[PDB]
RNA sequence: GCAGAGGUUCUAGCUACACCCUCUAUAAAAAACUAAGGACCACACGA
DNA sequence: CTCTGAATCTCTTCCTCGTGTGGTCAGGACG
DNA sequence: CGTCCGAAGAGATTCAGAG
């Protein structure tokens, strides 16, 4: 076939070489693959799993149980019994899946949470069922996405899978303290629809005894889901030394927000469920629940919030339609003004007043201005146009439009992704990156011209090729990051080093990109921080900066905090726990031993697929 | 007027733009190309002819022996397409080639020959393509995709930027030939023109001029402008021309004819040039310091001694000036150097170049080409002449010469294939001009530089390779051959040419295994335009530029249908209207625009000449006079969209569907959904599995009929007539009298292909679409093939779809499917499996196929017959036994675990010599019976047709109705008929029938021998048994279901119908999609498709309501007319009064299942039209209705969107994907999972997953699954014994892969060991 | 049940990952049972 | 005249897993 | 029955400018 024939060095180097093909990562037994299914009824500690897959993977366990119970005298007869799929075999199978975790594994395991443990729930079917919450952690779709399942065999393997790899044990991503099992796409939309208000809705005004009465009114259908009604709640706070005190008050709210109150655990305050509850609000809610209640209450609350979000999104019927995306009435006049302006610029260029470069710049600027104007008109038509009364004359409220609810909530969408539907799609660039002079004025609700779609597919092909190259580049970067690492583990607990890095909020000419509260959180200081009062030990030398310490830092108005950096650690062949800081996945100091080089490499390399490829000084505020 | 099948169900077609050009035959790119290759071309251009003529000199060395091609003719194929597919043999035509061998006398080259030997020799075995434009190679329907590669010619690239890491732009020119050696002329960063031939070491390109028999004086005369210097008494008066002063600096004080024009420090203004031209100055005095900066042009010697005073091309100094002045060189030639534009580049190379003679140049070229050995002058000359001046070892096609002359701005179009001195110097001059600034570099991605190599061109190239390979052997043999001692058949053998052609057609970088699962898949895979391939850029070597779409792709290559992944934009498909030029370039239909009128004349335009004219947009309104109603029309002049006046416009797009391909045109509302979603929808349409009962899409594009007819899936009617007899396996068409030939017309018989195994294990089922007596016109559809309904491409099956979240079962992209869908078998697809059993030769005796299998039960053997082969029609299950084969001392073929189904047929092939078993005899007997029955059926049918032909003629001029019934129908030549042309016609029919009767038994015997002869098989096999299993895979949770708009999802739960959201009418929605996928992934077309499908089903429901109750046909007619009019004017314009008033009932019954609506690609239904269509029925104009919860029973607030959108079912079923494994056979390296596939395997716990476990505190599960679960043999055995014992304890051991690595590193010669 | 052979079945069955009994040079009263091989290159497709 | 920096040339990859196919040293006759 | 014949960067390697 006229091809270079593999040598004694072609099988020790390269992707197909023995190292990276058979030693670094090797194929394994007790493994199966199938497409994945949502199955919302599951809890994140468990996953669905087909009967055939549990029968094939756990064949040695079934044989052992059959021998122990004497159903089959020999392995050979037991193997025949497994082939016959006799009913007794299924009952035996249910015994070996009671507390036997399996490692769900998606193919592009970018980061640590790519593979997680689950208690398999035997389902009839052929598709693995993956809990909806962990899909964001897996970055897994339901569009033919397949993930392998591995069966831990030894007591050590199953036990450590249960203790570490369980989705219950993976709530905070290793990259950052923010939760990773946050309500992502549909449950967040259901919660957002739940926590809103009409200025005039059915059953608005009457006082409610509690969340139970709110559920009674909503289910009976005599009160709207989101109507501004005063309710009485027993809000629990742990301001005492771990004891939870009860505060009862009549907080003005809606029925929908009162529904969620029975879901949240006792410790959480009511101020967290009294907003519109978008994606960011739910993320902050889950983070506060994790930092206050702990882990198990957070898991139970996440499961319950997923259940209610799905149920009330189904009850919402948040559809999508042509009338749901509105064309601004001022879009036509904005387009006319832009055409007049470009005609004037072209006429000026024809005379010779403006040459090609300045004409191109002027046309680009005026088209961008028209695009911004039409985007603002679209937002006004999509969130302000809604007119609804209050049993009076006239009032204006935030819109309940389907697309506005599905975009503003952060459920799925963004500013450009909503602009490309009703407003002007905008100036679309050529392959080389230089902007087409004339934009794609027509939006997706209306039709597109053939040239407009040609520019659109120019951009789309550019993006697809960019993604295809970028995923490979990010994989190479992740490999390099992992391999410069993997010799760095937390070998000690402390070093007594006063060295470190002075953590300061970063300013790049603009506002505060990252406050010091979110920049030093979870790290152990190197020297005592002091407030404006000098010789004040506000925070001692070697205390981890958890949420309470960081909150104290903000109210004391600290500026720069010296912190123990892993670079400054003098430990040999590893680093000490204090010089590293919080695990970023558990609310405590890093365990003595845990590999942080690979964690860091995966955290850095995971967003590689999400990256891209290509006077005077004025004071801002008083000070 | 409308075709009769169109009258059955006429598609409501939108689109205000009237079509001018009908859609071309989509398979033209393959059929026309091959028809050019296998055709006998008397002109000897483009075909097996050129290939024979190009390689038929056969000149013996001092032997006076010559062989020449005279004619050739492809033989009739040995086996038909169906026969070759079932046998596994290629569909090939024996290549009967006629050759003439002539021998001349010794030492008499001009004398006549002494003997002439003409005979037909079989050389080669060329496969043929079927009527569907697809080859059959080894029982597999394999298609060759056309390759889009950089055309031969000259291209001046830049490689701007990165080179030299200084911002200095380089320029290079590549002489890329069709076949031969590349020739690149590059620039050194110091502005030295180098040559780089075949990407070898860079060489001073002036050496090629010396290699072309050119000296320094000639080189400088060609590439530089001579400046004449005259020695005069007034300090060497200098001759200057006005043109050379443009753009110059103040070199000196220009004073001529006693007048000052330009002084020191004064720029030469064009006014100064004009005034000196008016003065007409020719001689201008120059200081002696200026000549120091000039360079001499030609050599000079003194007239006294002749010694070399000064050679050519070196700087001039004061001593050189004194020497030339004292010698008396009155005329001095100097080069014109202008650092602004006309800079010196050849001179610098000549300074670098140390070669001064042609022989030295040839020696250096030989050294840089073939180093390590001492070159020879004769050897170097032979190498150079065979490298550039020889046709056999170097050639540019006519397209290459055309591109060469286009880039060089020559006048002639054609020319010699090989290059010449003029070509090289012209290329160098153009490269120099590009460096200067005049002219522009070209774009590689331009479709004017990337031609298309079709299947015919590739086959011709491989045939030329085979001919030259056999020509070398013929020349070698003829050197020692003897005259009149051999037949002109021994020197040429079919073996090497046949091997080359078969290797190209079977195993190639481009011989794609056709994905024959959809008519759309077939039609878009035969039109696929791949950049990858032989003589083409590879995926890794492909740049970002090539993958990414060019502005010239408009109308030539679809910018929406490309495969995402490793090769995005490299395998782009060809647009619907584009056709390949005669030179391989891509043309595009374009309506000529007259003074102001858009004329109907269609002018195909290539990519190079598209820029010269200005192209109007298809979506430009016209006033029926060709006048744009639109004083400024958007246009595409130079690839830039820009408004133009009507009078400026030179051309207009042929239609609105031009840019998109057939795969992307079928998506309705393509102008609405995003380009990425459109890409994914077009890609997924190519992989939809045919449903059991395919049905027309309620909303479509109108090209489904065109795609179905153009593709070979359906049985189109070659001749019109009436359906005399229709059957599920055959259709008989009685040709009309005005559509049949006078002789050998008869009637048409169509044998529809029944359930047949396809390339992707799907059923190619053809069901009749007509009944008895139904009139059929020419070119009409008769059999609904796979994924076809009423002649319309029906890929999936449309159904009610409600866009609303449902308890998370459609969480992010998953699809929820009702129990009603599964119940009515909407997505049950028949899958045909090919389980083939082979009985190879074995040591210590062969193996038998009998039913005697040891250690098995009688229940398993019950299905098998007495001879050990499964009974046809038996319903076997997973793990069952099909054919009993026992090896000599239990290797019987068994059904794979999990898969089930019923056997449809069992074909057995047995080699001649070994006696066939009982089942083989029974199958052969049944095959003979079926062949005889079919032959007798066609006998009786054609005899009835011919008698009807005779009886119709015999109604006048000697008609005897009673006499005909008296004598038997066998004999009619004794009848008395008038001696006229009718009698001659009857005599001709009688003679033809007699010859047919003589040939009937001959062809029956031929068929009997075909079914009796032992089929050719692989060496060392006894007999091969193929068992075809038909699997009916129903829709299941996990099956990948996807619409046409890029919305893809796995079915999560088969929700019972009682739980489905039902409207006020009570009809439950069949599928509950997720609205959240619409805004982010802007597939807004599916919402338009959903609303239009809702309107279509509303019309269908109104028709059903007025049809279930007995209503007058007038109401149906008026409602149908109202539906087809629909307000805004459309091209459809169908009138219901012209119908027969009883086919209106048939039309209404065909519209009961829903109104068929066509939405063209870019001028489809507007929002107003859809709103009016909803208003036509009882459905609300908003498009979304209130739905009540299936379980709770109370209506959802915020009424949800429902409609009948056409969503497919992809062949990525969950049944295929299940791969669970505990223990199995292991690999070479002892990695147990054995590369998991059909072979029972475990999934690769790759390096990323190992890192993921490392990030966790995992050291026991990782260790177990990288050691005791994968390759530790002792570890694996101990772990298995422990788990079956019940103690899940790991005996670690060591991976055997590490021992393999140690042995491999040791084998290199590097001791790697372990310390104890 | 660890080195071999025999037994009622079905050529052969001694733990071969492997299923019952006997003993250290001898073959049968006895039902559930049996088999331990298998690479690379290209294409297309999915995520 | 011997190193300095700089151009030139050569090496070394350039994601990560699946699922369908198809093609692959090819000794060959003689003691 | 067997037996002998693009691309992107890094580093080594020339290779060169200046006293
Ligand atoms: Mg996905």
């Amino acid at each position: 076939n006229k091809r270079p024939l593999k040598s004694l060095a072609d099988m020790i180097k390269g992707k197909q070489g023995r190292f990276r093909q058979n030693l670094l990562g090797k194929r394994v037994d007790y493994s199966g693959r199938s497409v994945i299914t949502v199955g919302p009824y599951l809890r994140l500690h468990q996953c669905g799993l087909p009967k055939k897959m549990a029968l094939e993977l756990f064949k040695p366990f079934i044989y052992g149980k059959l021998e122990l119970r004497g159903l089959a005298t020999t392995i050979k007869a037991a193997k025949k019994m497994v082939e016959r799929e006799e009913a007794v075999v299924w009952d035996i199978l249910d015994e070996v899946i009671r507390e036997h975790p399996v490692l769900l594994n998606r193919a592009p395991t970018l980061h640590r949470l790519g593979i997680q443990a689950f208690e398999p729930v035997l389902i009839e079917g052929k598709a693995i069922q993956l809990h909806p919450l962990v899909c964001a952690a897996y970055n897994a779709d339901f569009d033919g996405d397949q993930m392998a399942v591995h069966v831990p065999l030894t007591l050590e393997a199953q036990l450590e899978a249960r203790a570490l790899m369980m989705s219950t044990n993976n709530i905070l991503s290793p990259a950052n303290g923010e939760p990773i099992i946050v309500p992502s796409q549909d449950v967040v939309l259901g919660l957002y629809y739940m926590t809103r208000d009409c200025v005039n809705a059915k059953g608005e005004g009457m006082v409610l005894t509690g969340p139970k009465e709110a559920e009674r009114l909503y289910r009976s259908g005599l009160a709207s889901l989101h109507a501004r009604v005063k309710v009485r709640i027993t809000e629990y706070e742990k301001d005492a030394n771990g004891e939870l005190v009860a505060k009862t008050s009549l907080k003005d709210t809606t029925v929908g927000r009162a529904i969620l109150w029975m879901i949240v655990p006792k410790g959480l305050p009511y101020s967290i469920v009294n907003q519109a509850l978008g994606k960011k609000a739910i993320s902050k809610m889950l983070n506060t629940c994790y930092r206050i209640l702990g882990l198990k209450p957070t898991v139970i609350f996440a499961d319950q919030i997923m259940y209610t979000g799905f149920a009330y999104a189904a009850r919402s019927g948040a559809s999508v339609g042509i009338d749901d995306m509105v064309i601004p009435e001022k879009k036509h006049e904005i387009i006319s003004e832009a055409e007049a302006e470009v005609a004037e610029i072209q006429e000026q260029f024809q005379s010779g007043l403006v040459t090609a470069g300045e004409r191109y710049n002027k046309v680009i600027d005026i088209w961008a201005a028209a695009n911004d104007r039409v985007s603002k008109a679209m937002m006004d038509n999509l969130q302000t146009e809604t007119v609804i009364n209050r049993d009076g004359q006239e009032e204006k409220q935030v819109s309940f439009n389907s697309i506005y609810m599905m975009a503003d909530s952060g459920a799925r969408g963004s500013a450009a992704q909503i602009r490309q539907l009703a407003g002007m799609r905008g100036l679309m660039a050529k392959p080389d990156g230089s902007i087409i002079e004339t934009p794609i004025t027509a939006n997706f609700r209306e039709g597109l011209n053939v040239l407009q779609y040609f520019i659109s597919t120019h951009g789309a092909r550019k993006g697809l090729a960019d993604t295809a190259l970028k995923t490979a580049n990010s994989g190479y970067l992740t490999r390099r990051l992992v391999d410069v690492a993997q010799d760095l583990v937390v070998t000690e607990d402390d070093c007594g080093t006063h060295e470190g890095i002075m953590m300061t909020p970063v300013i790049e000419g603009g506002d505060v990109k990252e406050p010091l509260r979110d920049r030093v959180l979870g790290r152990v200081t190197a020297e005592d921080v002091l407030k404006p009062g000098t010789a004040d030990i506000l925070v001692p030398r070697n205390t981890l900066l958890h949420e309470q310490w960081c909150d104290l830092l903000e109210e004391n108005s600290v500026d720069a905090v010296k912190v123990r950096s892993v670079v400054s650690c003098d430990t040999d062949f590893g680093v000490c726990a204090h010089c590293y800081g919080r695990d970023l996945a558990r609310g405590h100091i890093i365990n003595k031993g845990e590999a942080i080089g690979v964690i860091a490499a995966q955290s850095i390399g995971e967003p590689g697929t999400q990256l891209t490829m290509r006077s005077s000084i004025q004071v801002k505020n008083k000070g | 007027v409308y075709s009769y099948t169109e009258k059955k169900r006429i598609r409501k077609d939108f689109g205000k733009r009237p079509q001018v050009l009908d859609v071309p035959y989509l398979l033209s790119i393959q059929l026309d190309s091959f028809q050019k290759f296998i055709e006998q071309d008397p002109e000897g251009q483009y075909g097996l002819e050129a290939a024979f003529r190009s390689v038929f000199p056969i000149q013996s060395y001092s032997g006076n022996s010559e062989l020449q091609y005279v004619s050739y003719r492809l033989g009739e194929p040995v086996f038909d397409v169906q026969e070759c597919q079932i046998r596994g043999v290629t569909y090939s035509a024996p290549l009967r080639v006629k050759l003439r061998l002539v021998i001349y006398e010794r030492e008499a080259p001009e004398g006549t020959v002494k003997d002439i030997k003409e005979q037909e020799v079989y050389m080669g075995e060329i496969p043929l393509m079927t009527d569907n434009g697809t080859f059959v190679i080894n029982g597999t329907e394999r298609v060759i995709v056309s390759q889009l590669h950089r055309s031969p010619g000259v291209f001046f690239d830049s490689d701007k930027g990165k080179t030299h890491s200084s911002g200095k732009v380089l320029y290079n020119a590549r002489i890329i030939p069709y076949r031969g050696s590349w020739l690149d002329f590059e620039f050194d960063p110091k502005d030295n023109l180098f040559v780089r031939i075949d990407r070898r070491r860079k060489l001073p390109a002036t050496i090629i001029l010396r290699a072309l028999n050119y000296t320094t004086e000639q080189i400088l005369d060609l590439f530089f402008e001579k400046v004449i210097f005259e020695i005069r008494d007034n300090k060497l008066q200098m001759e200057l021309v006005p043109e050379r002063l443009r753009g110059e600096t103040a070199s000196f004080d220009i004073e001529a004819n006693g007048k000052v024009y330009v002084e020191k420090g004064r720029r030469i203004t064009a006014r100064h040039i004009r005034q000196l031209e008016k003065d007409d100055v020719k001689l201008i005095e120059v200081p002696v310091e200026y000549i120091a900066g000039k360079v001499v042009a030609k050599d000079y010697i003194d007239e006294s001694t002749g010694e070399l005073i000064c050679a050519a091309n070196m700087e001039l100094s004061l001593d050189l000036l004194a020497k030339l002045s004292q010698s008396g060189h009155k005329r001095i030639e100097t080069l014109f150097t202008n650092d602004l534009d006309h800079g010196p580049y050849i001179s610098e190379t000549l300074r670098v170049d140390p070669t001064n003679d042609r022989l030295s140049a040839l020696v250096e070229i030989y050294r840089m080409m073939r180093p390590g050995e001492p070159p020879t002058r004769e050897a170097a000359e032979s190498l150079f002449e065979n490298l550039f001046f020889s046709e056999d070892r170097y050639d540019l096609s006519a397209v290459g010469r055309m591109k060469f002359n286009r880039s060089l701005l020559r006048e002639e179009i054609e020319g010699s294939g090989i290059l010449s001195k003029d070509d090289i110097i012209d290329v160098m001059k153009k490269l120099i001009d590009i460096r200067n600034g005049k002219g522009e570099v070209d774009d590689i991605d331009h479709l004017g530089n990337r031609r298309i190599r079709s299947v015919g061109e590739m086959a011709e190239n491989q045939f030329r390779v085979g001919l030259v390979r056999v020509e070398r052997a013929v020349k070698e043999r003829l050197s020692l051959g003897d005259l009149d001692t051999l037949m002109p058949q021994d020197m040429i053998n079919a073996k090497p040419i046949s091997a080359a052609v078969k290797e190209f057609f079977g195993s190639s970088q481009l011989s794609q295994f056709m994905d024959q699962n959809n008519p759309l898949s077939e039609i878009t895979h035969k039109r696929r335009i791949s950049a990858l391939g032989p003589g083409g850029l590879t995926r890794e070597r492909a740049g970002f530029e090539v993958r990414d779409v060019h502005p010239t792709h408009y109308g030539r290559v679809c910018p929406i249908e490309t495969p995402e992944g490793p090769n995005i934009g490299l395998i782009n498909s060809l647009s619907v209207y584009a056709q390949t030029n005669e030179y391989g370039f891509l043309e595009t239909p374009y309506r000529k625009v007259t003074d102001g009128v858009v004329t109907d004349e269609i002018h195909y335009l290539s990519a190079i000449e598209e820029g010269n004219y200005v192209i109007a947009q298809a979506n430009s309104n016209l006033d029926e006079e060709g006048h744009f109603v639109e004083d400024l029309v958007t246009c595409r002049s130079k690839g830039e969209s820009s408004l133009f006046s009507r009078d400026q416009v030179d051309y207009m797009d042929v239609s609105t569907q031009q840019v998109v391909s057939v795969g992307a045109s079928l998506i309705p509302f393509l102008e609405h959904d995003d380009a990425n979603r459109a890409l994914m929808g077009a890609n997924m349409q190519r992989q939809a599995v045919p449903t059991l009962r395919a049905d027309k899409p309620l909303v479509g594009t109108g090209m489904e009929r065109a795609v179905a007819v153009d593709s070979g899936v359906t049985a189109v009617a070659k001749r019109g007539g009436v359906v005399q007899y229709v059957d599920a396996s055959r259709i008989v068409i009685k040709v009309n009298e005005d559509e049949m030939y006078p002789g050998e017309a008869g009637i048409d018989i169509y044998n529809l292909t029944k359930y047949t195994r396809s390339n992707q294990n799907t059923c190619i089922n053809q069901m009749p679409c007509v009944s008895l007596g139904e009139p059929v016109e020419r070119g009409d559809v008769l059999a609904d093939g796979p994924s076809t309904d009423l002649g319309e491409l029906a890929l999936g099956q449309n159904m009610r779809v409600a866009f609303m979240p449902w308890n998370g079962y459609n969480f992010e992209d998953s699809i929820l499917v009702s129990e009603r869908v599964v119940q009515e078998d909407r997505f049950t697809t028949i899958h045909i499996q090919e389980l083939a059993c082979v009985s190879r030769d074995t040591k210590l005796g062969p193996e038998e196929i009998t039913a005697d299998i040891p250690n098995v039960g009688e229940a398993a053997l019950s299905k098998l017959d007495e001879s050990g082969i499964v009974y046809i029609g038996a319903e076997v299950t997973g793990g069952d036994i099909l054919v009993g084969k026992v090896t000599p001392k239990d290797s019987s073929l068994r059904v794979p675990n999990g898969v089930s189904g019923t056997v449809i047929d069992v074909q057995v092939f047995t080699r001649d010599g070994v006696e066939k078993d009982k089942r083989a005899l029974e199958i052969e007997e049944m095959q003979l019976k079926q062949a005889k029955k079919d032959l007798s059926e066609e006998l009786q049918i054609l005899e009835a047709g011919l008698f009807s032909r005779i009886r119709a003629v015999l109604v006048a001029g000697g008609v005897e109705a009673e006499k005909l019934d008296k004598l038997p129908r066998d004999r009619w030549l004794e009848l008395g008929l008038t001696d006229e042309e009718k009698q001659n016609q009857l005599e001709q029919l009688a003679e033809q029938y007699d010859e047919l009767k003589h040939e009937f038994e001959k062809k029956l015997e031929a068929k009997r021998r075909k079914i009796t002869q032992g089929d050719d098989l692989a060496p060392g096999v006894l007999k091969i048994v193929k068992v075809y299993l038909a699997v009916k895979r129903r829709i299941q949770p996990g099956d990948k279901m996807a619409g046409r708009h890029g919305n893809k999802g796995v079915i999560s739960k088969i929700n019972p119908i009682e739980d489905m959201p039902y409207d006020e009418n009570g009809t439950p929605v069949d599928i509950v999609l997720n609205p959240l996928g619409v805004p982010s992934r802007m597939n807004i077309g599916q919402i338009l498709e959903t609303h239009l499908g809702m309107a279509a089903k509303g019309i269908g429901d109104k028709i059903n309501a007025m049809l279930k109750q007995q209503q007058e046909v007038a109401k149906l007619r008026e409602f149908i007319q109202r539906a087809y009019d629909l307000g805004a004017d459309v091209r459809q314009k169908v009138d219901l009064s012209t119908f027969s008033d009883e086919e209106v009932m048939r039309l209404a019954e065909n519209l009961r299942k829903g109104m068929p609506i066509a939405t063209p690609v870019f001028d489809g239904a507007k929002e107003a039209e859809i709103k009016e269509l909803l208003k036509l029925g009882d459905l609300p104009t908003s498009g979304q209705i209130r739905l009540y919860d299936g379980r709770t029973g109370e209506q959802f607030e915020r009424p949800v969107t429902v409609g009948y959108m056409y969503m497919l079912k992809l062949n990525h079923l969950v049944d295929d994907k299940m791969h669970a494994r505990s223990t199995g056979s292991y690999s070479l390296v002892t990695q147990q999972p054995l590369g998991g596939k059909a072979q029972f395997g475990g999934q690769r716990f790759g390096e990323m997953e190992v890192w993921a476990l490392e990030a966790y505190g995992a050291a026991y599960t990782l260790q177990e699954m990288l050691t005791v679960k994968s390759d530790d043999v002792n570890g694996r055995t101990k772990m298995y014994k422990n788990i079956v014992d019940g103690n899940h304890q790991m005996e670690p051991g060591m991976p055997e892969s590490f021992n393999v690595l140690l042995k491999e590193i040791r084998s290199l010669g590097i001791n790697i060991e372990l310390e104890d």
Side-chain angles (χ1 to χ4, degrees), chain A residues 141-143 145:
Chain A
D141 271 7
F142 291 103
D143 65 9
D145 298 342

Side-chain angles (χ1 to χ4, degrees), chain B residues 2 316 408 518 580 655 675 938 985 1037 1110 1183 1214 1255 1266 1274 1281:
Chain B
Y2 270 106
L316 271 78
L408 296 197
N518 262 341
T580 293
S655 70
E938 68 90 13
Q985 166 210 14
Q1110 297 328 292
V1214 65
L1266 138 116
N1274 321 308
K1281 293 177 182 179

Side-chain angles (χ1 to χ4, degrees), chain A residues 106 139-145, chain B residues 812-813 1048:
Chain A
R106 200 169 176 261
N139 207 38
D141 271 7
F142 291 103
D143 65 9
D145 298 342
Chain B
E812 59 94 29
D813 215 358
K1048 46 197 193 310

